[PDB]
Structure formats: C-alpha cells, structure tokens
Design a protein around this ligand. Structure first.
Ligand SMILES: CCCCC[C@H](CC(=O)NO)C(=O)N[C@H](C(=O)N1CCC[C@H]1CO)C(C)C
Ligand SMILES: CCCCC[C@H](CC(=O)NO)C(=O)N[C@H](C(=O)N1CCC[C@H]1CO)C(C)C
Ligand SMILES: [Zn+2]
Ligand SMILES: [Zn+2]
Lengths: 146, 149
C-alpha cells in the first residue's frame, strides 16, 4: 500500500553504485514488500519505471512497465550500435531531455523468486531498462546529455 | 527471517545522512518487514545494535539491543537525541561494518517513533547510551573510527 519518498537530484544516494540483492532475500516477504512499495510509488507518480536508489534503497532492483516487470540484479549483456533518441524525464529530476539509447538490449536478471531469466527489449522498454540500470550505477539521464 | 548483506567501511552508503521515514510508511508492512530483516541480521552477526544504512537502506531506523547490560531490543524510527549528558564514558567499540576507544555521553535522552508511529521519550544510561550514539552516528554518516580521539 505504501508510497515511498523519492530522492531528488542533488541527493548523494542517487550517485552510488547500488549493491546486489543477496540469495537470502530472494522469494522473501522482505523483497516482495520492497517491490510492492516501489511499484506503488511508480504508479502514484505516473512512472513507467523506477529504481530502488530513488526511494533511498541502495539495492539493484528496478521495475520496467511501459505488465510491470520486476528485475533483480539486472545486467545489460549487449547493446545494439543502432541508436535512437527519446524524450526522458525522471521522478528524481523535477527538466526533461532528449537522450540517445541503444535501440535494443539483451538483459539478464532474477525474478522475485530468484529464477534466472534472459531477454531482449526494443525501442521504449529498452530505453526504460537503460535508464533504470543507469540509476543502479549512480547516473542520471542529464549526465547522458550535453 | 531474512539475513541481509551488510556494508563495510569504504562503501559510501555509510557516509550519507539517512532520510527520515515518512508518515505514510509508519505502521506499514514495509516497515515491519524492514525492521524484522534488520533484527535477524543483527542477531546473526552478534551485534548489540544496527542501523538501516548498514543494510543499504538509507532510512532513519535503528535497533538497540544491549546483549554489557541485557535489555529487550528496541526499534526506533526517526530517533533524535534531545540531550546528551556532560558526563562521559570511554570503552572499546567495534562495528559490523569495520576496534578501539570511543568517548561517549554516559546518558542520553532520546525521542523516537515506534513502528506504529507512537512517540516515545526514553533516557539511556551506560552502554545502551553508547549503542544509541553509535547507531545515530550511522544515520548521520559517521563511523566510530572517526571518533577514536
Ligand atoms: C523514458 C525512459 C524511462 C524513464 C522512467 C521515468 C521513471 C524514473 O525516473 N525511473 O528511474 C518515467 O516514468 N518518466 C516519465 C517519462 O519520461 N515518460 C512517461 C511516458 C513517456 C515517457 C517519456 O517522456 C515521466 C514521469 C517523466
Ligand atoms: C557502543 C558500541 C556499539 C557497537 C555496535 C556494533 C554493531 C554495529 O555496528 N551497529 O551499528 C556491535 O554490535 N559491536 C560489538 C561490540 O562492540 N560489543 C559486543 C558486546 C559488547 C561490545 C564489546 O565492545 C561487536 C560486534 C564488536
Ligand atoms: Zn529516473
Ligand atoms: Zn556500527
């Protein structure tokens, strides 16, 4: 049910490298409750994704929802050299911007139950993925512009 | 219960000022679960307290659980030390995230919220007072090794 407070540009939490979710957390009430609160917060703000650092949780959890998918410890395995520009805004940057992304990405991640999945995204979902994974590595979208 | 991974000295999560728990989070399953995982992790690491930043959660939640006197564990949300005593004690401190000597106030008066969100004000003495000072230092981005003076 909970909507979490969101960190804004300037706050140091957003510039860290987020720590991996551990094995013990997989399939826990702990992790389901985190994911649920992140999903509620994204919904309240009209987001199509969210990353844990943005709700002060320095853990590698994102949600992508252009059904909403929860990804634990995601890794982008390859980017296409084919690029595309999209307009991005960020819940943490209250300034929107035109940003180049790989048109396609191959990604590996864990579900909340801890099952390994691998998949490709194209177009907008793929931009969402790259934006959220950027949050996990301490990067805001404005740093990908200039 | 879940045992969580713990940040060690030189991870920058430990150097931030942790954000206050919001009103909407009080009395939520979210918060009960966070506190439960913190509690399990402290027990499994043989600590006598824990702060949320140590488990990568940049939020103002601590647990004080001396064993040293023995007390029942207390969870404190948005804790605030309203008064430190002029009296001081010095004793060996170590941290799940790092030992040596630290001068602490011998008494502290602390105001905090329970997990339901009830306000409580309590005076700690001796070692529990040191535990509180240490955990609140974690919330403000300070490790005890910065206090070996
Ligand atoms: C675009 C790449 C993904 C950005 C995801 C963000 C959410 C966020 O900050 N995640 O870290 C969002 O939903 N942003 C929205 C957004 O940019 N949207 C919403 C629909 C179209 C798209 C492009 O402007 C609004 C809320 C600013
Ligand atoms: C005022 C001291 C408070 C220290 C709290 C730490 C745990 C911690 O890092 N919390 O943020 C701890 O449990 N440290 C233990 C500790 O210092 N103990 C355990 C029993 C008594 C005392 C010995 O000095 C061990 C793990 C080294
Ligand atoms: Zn964002
Ligand atoms: Zn400590």
């Amino acid at each position: 049910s909970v909507v979490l407070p969101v960190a804004k540009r300037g706050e140091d939490i957003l510039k860290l490298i987020a720590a991996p979710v551990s094995a013990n957390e997989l399939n826990s009430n702990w992790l389901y409750q985190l994911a649920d609160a992140m999903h509620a917060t994204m919904l309240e703000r009209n987001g199509v994704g969210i990353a844990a650092p943005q709700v002060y949780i320095s853990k590698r959890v994102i949600i992508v929802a252009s059904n909403a998918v929860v990804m634990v410890n995601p890794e982008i395995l390859e980017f296409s050299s084919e690029m595309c520009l999209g307009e991005e805004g960020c819940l943490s940057v209250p300034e929107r911007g035109q940003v180049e992304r790989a048109e396609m990405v191959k990604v590996k991640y864990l579900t909340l139950q801890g099952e390994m999945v691998e998949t490709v995204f194209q177009g907008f979902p793929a931009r969402i993925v790259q934006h959220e994974v950027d949050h996990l590595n301490g990067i805001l979208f404005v740093e990908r512009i200039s």
